[PDB]
Design a protein around this ligand. Structure first.
Ligand SMILES: CCCCCCCC/C=C\CCCCCCCC(=O)O[C@H](COC(=O)CCCCCCCCCCCCCCC)COP(=O)(O)OC[C@@H](O)CO
Ligand SMILES: CCCCCCCC/C=C\CCCCCCCC(=O)O[C@H](COC(=O)CCCCCCCCCCCCCCC)COP(=O)(O)OC[C@@H](O)CO
Ligand SMILES: CCCCCCCC/C=C\CCCCCCCC(=O)O[C@H](COC(=O)CCCCCCCCCCCCCCC)COP(=O)(O)OC[C@@H](O)CO
Ligand SMILES: CCCCCCCC/C=C\CCCCCCCC(=O)O[C@H](COC(=O)CCCCCCCCCCCCCCC)COP(=O)(O)OC[C@@H](O)CO
Ligand SMILES: Nc1ncnc2c1ncn2[C@@H]1O[C@@H]2COP(=O)(O)O[C@H]2[C@H]1O
Ligand SMILES: Nc1ncnc2c1ncn2[C@@H]1O[C@@H]2COP(=O)(O)O[C@H]2[C@H]1O
Ligand SMILES: Nc1ncnc2c1ncn2[C@@H]1O[C@@H]2COP(=O)(O)O[C@H]2[C@H]1O
Ligand SMILES: Nc1ncnc2c1ncn2[C@@H]1O[C@@H]2COP(=O)(O)O[C@H]2[C@H]1O
Lengths: 389, 389, 389, 389
């Protein structure tokens, strides 16, 4: 690729102007060594209108720079040489078309502060009287004053002394010390905006835990829920698969679900090779669910028939009481299907042996796909009639 | 119109007082040239009670001004000449009856700051001792002090030196440096309140995109959803037509829907000339929906019959497989209607060729309008029986 | 009543202590004239335990004050004479049991600031060296310093000069300049918390108005919705009668609805004298609804029968077209009832003549009360069969 | 237990380093007495990798400390002796695995401020010139400067005077005066996050009370709702048993409900000894409900049959009118069950005598458990047929 390099070179050039132009405006001793670099940048400035596949980018290309510096034009006209800074408000969104978007918006709001402070400090040095000082010390004092004023510290060791400096200080205090607070608050808001899934899950578990304690609850149950919440966060990161997909259209939701539940399909024997249209029919009706250890799922005698497709874990299916346990199931298997095949209530208790994660499909869709597909119905029928001993 | 000019002249006059009255209170050298202007303004002040088609506007008309300045009355009585400023809290809502309301509330909260700062600076100059200084410099120093104090910079180069100045400074610090923060925070809140549709759509797409990546998703699908979101924002601006109309009453919602869906009616042949009562019956049951390119809509054999009225785009209707594609449809046409006419499942696959935007009406309302209207039912019946080849 | 006076006297006494005790701690010249007042207050302090129909009120009664001041006890023991300030954190909720609760919480958060600032200023004067200054000037300077430090202005004209003053300044900066910001933010939040109904209705109408304009809408309809919203705010203040009553229990909701809809009952002839149990049955099923001028309600031929009990306004019932309009209805009347009496569709169009406010009861409850009550059913039957001409 | 002591010793050691290391870096006169303590701490630092039942804890164990201080290595290499502070960002979550989580997060955000301020003050003393001053005064001045700068007071009595001190001050102002605001705002947010149930109930009752007054409501009803809200808060603390349990899985919700409703089971005669499976069936279908004094529940003649299991309070069952009241019921009893036993409407009015709290089970589940269990059905049948006189 080459857009990723071109839009980085453009950023490095529009920052080069943003740093160099005011420093040349205050120090006329420059522009002698830095002319080839400036023209090499400007030819790239005019080399972007053809590569457009709005108006601020048009203003930036015209070279008012190279003219004011060459003709030592008077200060009021020359101050308008800042038109090349208009690419800054046209690139921060053009360079956004490329990591976390929130992270790019924290780095962008810093560079803006460090450029505005440099501009204000450079403007402040221009209004001071002519003194025989090194450029480094004179710039350091101006930057120190600008950081003191913007942060609203106000040491007062150096202060304006002339009416024009007083007016400049008033303007900077009025509309520079308030915008800094806005940018700092935005930086705080979008550094808090990071990893919001953790900040949501933590708030949820705190809200649950507060109530589980006003009503005093046995520690053997109080610690059993924290384990489940830790497991849910540790296997799912607090994300929920329903509210995220609520806004996507049904074909796009179908395409996403074809990717997320890519593990349970083609794992159980009767999903791989079952076709394409059946899996497309059923992929939107399976819910994740998590069952803890020693935690019953089927109680051997109630109504209803929900089938549990095991994704990971193991169950310990038993009769009414223990009495020589029937068998054990593992990953890539399912149970609880013959309650609807034989139109009979549950015949055996099922309890998990570890933190099982498994997918449940309701009775309604199951009977629909029994009445809709013959091979699947025949397979479940023969498996149910065979598993009777 | 003339209200739009009168309520601007009134604003320009009530700002004229807000600027002139304290400056005349501190400098008695005025009131000599500015008497005809003040009486010309005051006659407009008393020319608004008849044009009332509450109490602060009544206080403002009485001319306490013109009296205190003429009679050089002592300072305690004269300070109460500020009653003409009471029109400010009666006009900012009267001038609101006229652009973005949020924008008018950002401009209003600025002028308030620039008027309060001027008032505080003017009050500060009055308490200083009698010195032979130009009025401009003495006002500039006072305004510099006021901006320093309100912004909470606190340079300290000029400070109160008398007990009365100390009390004034204490009052300004207590109830002027905190209100400024409130107004600045309000300005920030209602400049963030602007273009909230973009700030909602961006948050929604960021929330979706965060989860589509913890579960690693193929780039060919990861980039396919961003395209759909960009198209939705680019054709709809993130607005949703359901929550906005949830609060409007049913006749007003009907009237609005008569305007929003003004393109699909009188475009398809059987909506123009179909009457008024039928269109009024159906206009609230069509949903927008967006289908991407190469994205199937009908899969040729499932149950149900939802009719898709094409608004813009084109479909590529096919049989079970390709095998000499049937035909092609374009704007101002509809399909998927003969599944309910013949009480038969779908007979042909339909897939979009571009980013199609089209309106879907459910089976229930369709069968209702078939059983309710004879001409429409006959037209759909003959069209369905004709389109069989 | 006498609680309203006693709990005001108690406030005036616990503020008397909060102002007097530190001022006596720093100036020992007091306690000579102000002894009878202090004992008169203290006897009321001990006169509240019997009037208890928790522990801070017990600490406050014991008179550590009257002892430290009398015995000129050394400074470390005497500083613990501030136990009488513990009534402040026991009264602000006891005096709350009495206007807007939010307003009482804005006044309370001010007095707290003005008491904390006074305490900090009084503490600061005690640490300064012995100088021959008037008490007023010495207190004014201390209060000026405290307001400068708390507000984070930091003029720096007067600063700590000794290690103990440095430690005191560090403590005040650390835990006094941050709490002030918290209290100011709370004051802002609960002055914004006032009149929240207007702030909700304004936000709702702004949200609606933003979308009605991206889709360009005729001015004759764009101004017709603003009129309806203005009328709704002007007759209802933006309150909704459903979400407010969602949390009240059904008997309390019934009792409230017996009061809110006190105008439509005993206005229409067949509600007054209809009993008590019938009105109690129907009072929870009538909804307010607002219809604009020239805005149809019934379209003469559709299905369904909803009865509209007119509360205020007038309707202009017509046939299919105008053709010598049938009649006119006014307040305390109802229409649209014979559609269910004769099991026939609507026979006449109804349109409002002004901004009508009226109550609608659905068909289900209507047929229920027809099948449940004979006199009401007979009255509606004879009225419907009579109104046919 | 011993983890609770070990993870406190580790905290006390990692704070010992955080306080001692910079103070030794600036004052080389130390490290002579404090060597055995440092090695005793370091042996515990290396005694935690075996007790791991990530990478910052590995960096901390290696003893760069003990080396730089012993070898008086030059300042640039020695500044990297701060690696032992990396345990701070590994313990604040390890010590979290142990009171209110929000409270632990307010104490943690304080200690962080007091450690950062100490570090910045210690760094500031190192850059000052060599002066004959006591260590205490030199540290006090540095801490005073750091608190002044971080809080953004800016007294200006002591300011940087060298370019390196200017650069240090610029860095501290830029990234130390903004982080302090973030931490203070977080402290405010999570001290407001405390006791959120009260802050929710107060907001709810304020929202209800605002509307009950625009529509003027009789004081005898206006004060009757405040009593109910006070009773609900005073017996329930504003918590709701439905939204809290919405996220728990059905077995965990069942286990929690087995604990919360531990008072009504085994209180009424026919719940204790009724088994285990019946109580497990019914425990999720009983709702709390609160009825006020003199507040009717059953009106003797309507349809439906909801049974009210009395938990606390007493009812005053009456006939159509008073006429020698039937009887009185108390705790551990139920009524309103023979409306479904005999398929007849209600026969007697019921009204509470005090603030009754009782559990209601709907008709559907009741008839289900009648048709599902014979002993319970027989008991209710014989009790209903016996209670007829
Ligand atoms: C992360 C923080 C990174 C900071 C960048 C590096 C430090 C700043 C730049 C380097 C500063 C520097 O070295 O100091 C002097 C600057 O002199 C000069 O005229 C130089 C003047 C310009 C210095 C830089 C100004 C902008 C600083 C913007 C900071 C943003 C922080 C976020 C150079 O002489 P020297 O050392 O002998 O000292 C003076 C001597 O007389 C006594 O030591
Ligand atoms: C956007 C920002 C717009 C700013 C407005 C224009 C700038 C301010 C007004 C013009 C200020 C101005 O020209 O400065 C002097 C003011 O003198 C005087 O007595 C004039 C005193 C009054 C000046 C204005 C005071 C209020 C400023 C409120 C600013 C709000 C910003 C938001 C005039 O003499 P001169 O130039 O020779 O300098 C003094 C000489 O001795 C050395 O240069
Ligand atoms: C709303 C704002 C309300 C403010 C209250 C009234 C103003 C403040 C109190 C009155 C202040 C006052 O009158 O000033 C002097 C105070 O002297 C003294 O020792 C008095 C010292 C104490 C003054 C009061 C201190 C607390 C102020 C707390 C303000 C909170 C604002 C919110 C009295 O002498 P005089 O006038 O001749 O001036 C000195 C002379 O040498 C030159 O004019
Ligand atoms: C809750 C607030 C708790 C505060 C801790 C206790 C107070 C602070 C520590 C004690 C401070 C102290 O006693 O003051 C002097 C400090 O001298 C010295 O060199 C000592 C220098 C170090 C003092 C402590 C610095 C850090 C303070 C961090 C505060 C955080 C607050 C939250 C000791 O001499 P002395 O008394 O005779 O006075 C000087 C004499 O010349 C005139 O009185
Ligand atoms: N002998 C067995 N071996 C394996 N699984 C069984 C056996 N008996 C019952 N099951 C499963 O346990 C389930 C219990 O409930 P169902 O009757 O719905 O369906 C049952 C089968 O899925
Ligand atoms: N030959 C054809 N030409 C145009 N459209 C067709 C043709 N055959 C089928 N269709 C449309 O394709 C749709 C596919 O599903 P339906 O059977 O519901 O209704 C069908 C018609 O609307
Ligand atoms: N002549 C009339 N005078 C007054 N009201 C009428 C007259 N005719 C019809 N209405 C009312 O207008 C209503 C129109 O719809 P309905 O038929 O539901 O019930 C009708 C009556 O309530
Ligand atoms: N004599 C009585 N003693 C106690 N309780 C009664 C008596 N008569 C009726 N009840 C109860 O009051 C209830 C009123 O409504 P039900 O008829 O639903 O069921 C009734 C019984 O639970």
């Amino acid at each position: 690729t080459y857009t990723l390099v071109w839009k980085v070179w453009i950023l490095a050039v529009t920052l080069y102007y943003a740093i160099r132009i005011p420093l040349t405006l205050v120090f006329p001793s420059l522009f002698s060594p830095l002319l080839p670099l400036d023209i090499l940048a400007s030819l790239a400035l005019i080399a972007d209108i053809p590569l457009d596949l709005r108006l601020p980018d048009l203003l930036a290309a015209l070279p008012l720079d190279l003219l004011v510096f060459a003709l030592h034009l008077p200060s009021p006209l020359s101050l308008l040489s800042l038109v090349r800074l208009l690419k800054l408000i046209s690139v921060q969104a053009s360079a956004t078309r490329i990591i976390n978007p929130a992270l790019l918006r924290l780095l962008s709001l810093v560079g803006f502060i460090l450029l505005a402070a440099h501009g204000i400090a450079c403007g402040w040095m221009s209004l001071q009287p002519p003194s025989e000082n090194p450029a480094g010390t004179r710039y350091l004092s101006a930057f120190y004053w600008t950081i003191t004023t913007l942060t609203t510290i106000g040491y007062g060791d150096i202060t304006p002394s002339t009416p024009t400096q007083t007016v400049y200080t008033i303007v900077i205090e009025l509309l520079g010390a308030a915008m800094y607070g806005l940018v700092i608050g935005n930086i705080a808001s979008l550094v808090s905006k990071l990893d919001a899934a953790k900040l949501l899950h933590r708030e949820r578990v705190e809200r649950v835990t507060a109530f589980l304690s006003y009503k005093r609850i046995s520690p053997e149950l109080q610690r059993r829920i924290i384990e489940y919440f830790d497991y849910l966060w540790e296997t799912r990161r607090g994300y929920e698969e329903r509210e995220v997909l609520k806004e996507l259209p049904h074909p796009l939701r179908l395409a996403v679900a074809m990717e997320i539940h890519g593990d349970v399909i083609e794992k159980v024997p009767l999903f791989k090779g079952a076709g394409e249209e059946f899996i497309r029919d059923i992929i939107l009706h399976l819910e994740p669910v998590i069952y803890g250890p020693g935690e019953y799922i089927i109680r051997a005698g109630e109504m209803g028939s929900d089938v549990y497709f095991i994704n990971r874990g193991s169950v310990e299916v038993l009769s009414a009481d223990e009495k020589t346990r029937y068998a054990i199931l593992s990953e890539g298997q399912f149970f609880g299907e013959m309650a609807l095949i034989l139109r009979a209530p549950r015949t055996a208790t099922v309890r998990a042996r570890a933190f099982c994660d498994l997918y449940r499909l309701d009775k309604e869709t199951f009977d629909r796909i029994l009445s809709r597909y013959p091979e699947i119905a025949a397979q479940i029928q023969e498996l149910a009639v065979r598993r009777k001993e």
